[PDB]
Amino acid sequence: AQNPNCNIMIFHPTKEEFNDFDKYIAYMESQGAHRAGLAKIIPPKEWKARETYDNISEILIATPLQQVASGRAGVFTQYHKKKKAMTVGEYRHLANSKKYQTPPHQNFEDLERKYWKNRIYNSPIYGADISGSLFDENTKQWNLGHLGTIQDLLEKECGVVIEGVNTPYLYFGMWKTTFAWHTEDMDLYSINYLHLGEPKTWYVVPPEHGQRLERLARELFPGSSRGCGAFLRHKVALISPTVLKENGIPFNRITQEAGEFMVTFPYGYHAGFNHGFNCAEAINFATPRWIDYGKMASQCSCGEARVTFSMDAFVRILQPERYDLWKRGQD
Numbered sequence: 001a002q003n004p005n006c007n008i009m010i011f012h013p014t015k016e017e018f019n020d021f022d023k024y025i026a027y028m029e030s031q032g033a034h035r036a037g038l039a040k041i042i043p044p045k046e047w048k049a050r051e052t053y054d055n056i057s058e059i060l061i062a063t064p065l066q067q068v069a070s071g072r073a074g075v076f077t078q079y080h081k082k083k084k085a086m087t088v089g090e091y092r093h094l095a096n097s098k099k100y101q102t103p104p105h106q107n108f109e110d111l112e113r114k115y116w117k118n119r120i121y122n123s124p125i126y127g128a129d130i131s132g133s134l135f136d137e138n139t140k141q142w143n144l145g146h147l148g149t150i151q152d153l154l155e156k157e158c159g160v161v162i163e164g165v166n167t168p169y170l171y172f173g174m175w176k177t178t179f180a181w182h183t184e185d186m187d188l189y190s191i192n193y194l195h196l197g198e199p200k201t202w203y204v205v206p207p208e209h210g211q212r213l214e215r216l217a218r219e220l221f222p223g224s225s226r227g228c229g230a231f232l233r234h235k236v237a238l239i240s241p242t243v244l245k246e247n248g249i250p251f252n253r254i255t256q257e258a259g260e261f262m263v264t265f266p267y268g269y270h271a272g273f274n275h276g277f278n279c280a281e282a283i284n285f286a287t288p289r290w291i292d293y294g295k296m297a298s299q300c301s302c303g304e305a306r307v308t309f310s311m312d313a314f315v316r317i318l319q320p321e322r323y324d325l326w327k328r329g330q331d
């Protein structure tokens with residue numbers, strides 16, 4: 001069995017290996033990459049996503065989200081308070097202001113210590129989930145707006161043609177902006193490219209151990225757990241590495257820098273934070289190996305998780321018994 005300790009693997013494809021996206025994901029899995037739940041891909045030195053980032057300031061962040069925490073430093077939830085629209089140039093100036101900027105620090109480990117000690121006492125503003133792409137249309141390799149769609153994969157594997165579309169999303173971050181513990185919708189893969197700016201630190205639980213994280217989360221968030229049998233789908237709960245280690249939950253950590261891709265694998269729980277002003281692009285995708293995960297994925301039916309148009313067909317075809325209850329949650 002390849003990668004039996006479920007370590008995060010780092011790949012350095014050549015320009016020739018970077019041509020065929022599906023084939024390289026399958027290669028990474030042949031080496032056991034998926035057992036970690038997360039892998040890093042460093043593009044070949046010849047590759048670029050676009051020529052420059054000098055002309056992005058007029059992108060609009062229509063609904064910036066202020067991430068307000070409740071709880072204790074290692075075990076907290078966050079809610080998202082909607083703020084007035086601002087441009088990327090306005091948001092970058094805000095991120096760099098004395099109120100929001102990254103503090104002085106020694107290295108990534110010192111900054112991680114400061115994040116976990118102090119996150120709850122601040123409310124950073126995240127420009128998340130913005131439909132769009134920063135890949136140049138002429139970038140032919142690993143262009144997140146030109147991937148094979150999940151609807152086409154389902155059709156290729158299972159023969160059923162379905163409605164829906166699959167497009168990327170931009171994330172503009174600042175110091176302490178936070179992504180809560182989650183797997184993807186329908187336990188899909190994700191791919192995330194850090195286009196510019198400061199790093200993003202990730203935490204991940206191997207898919208084979210995801211139920212250990214879920215049982216801890218039910219213990220730590222007991223009211224939320226009574227409210228919903230899949231409340232991590234709400235994407236609001238945070239648990240620190242120290243707390244994970246105290247409770248024996250297997251996990252790994254890695255820091256992504258500008259110019260690097262991360263891939264999350266089906267049912268790989270992940271969480272993390274941004275180091276300072278940055279911009280990432282991410283999209284979900286599927287492979288043949290995903291189908292069995294999609295069929296078994298938990299679902300939120302309490303009404304909180306509210307998701308995209310295209311998840312309807314995935315539930316309807318892969319989980320017909322759950323469809324009626326899930327759809328009631330959506331309506």
Ligand SMILES: O=C(O)CNC(=O)C(=O)O
Nearest residue numbers: 171179190191192280282
């Ligand atoms: O970058 C973020 O805030 C969150 N991204 C992801 O969870 C992902 O790419 O799957």
Ligand SMILES: [Mg+2]
Nearest residue numbers: 056057058059
């Ligand atoms: Mg612009």
Ligand code: NI
Nearest residue numbers: 183184190270
């Ligand atoms: Ni994710």
Ligand SMILES: [Zn+2]
Nearest residue numbers: 228300302304
């Ligand atoms: Zn729910």
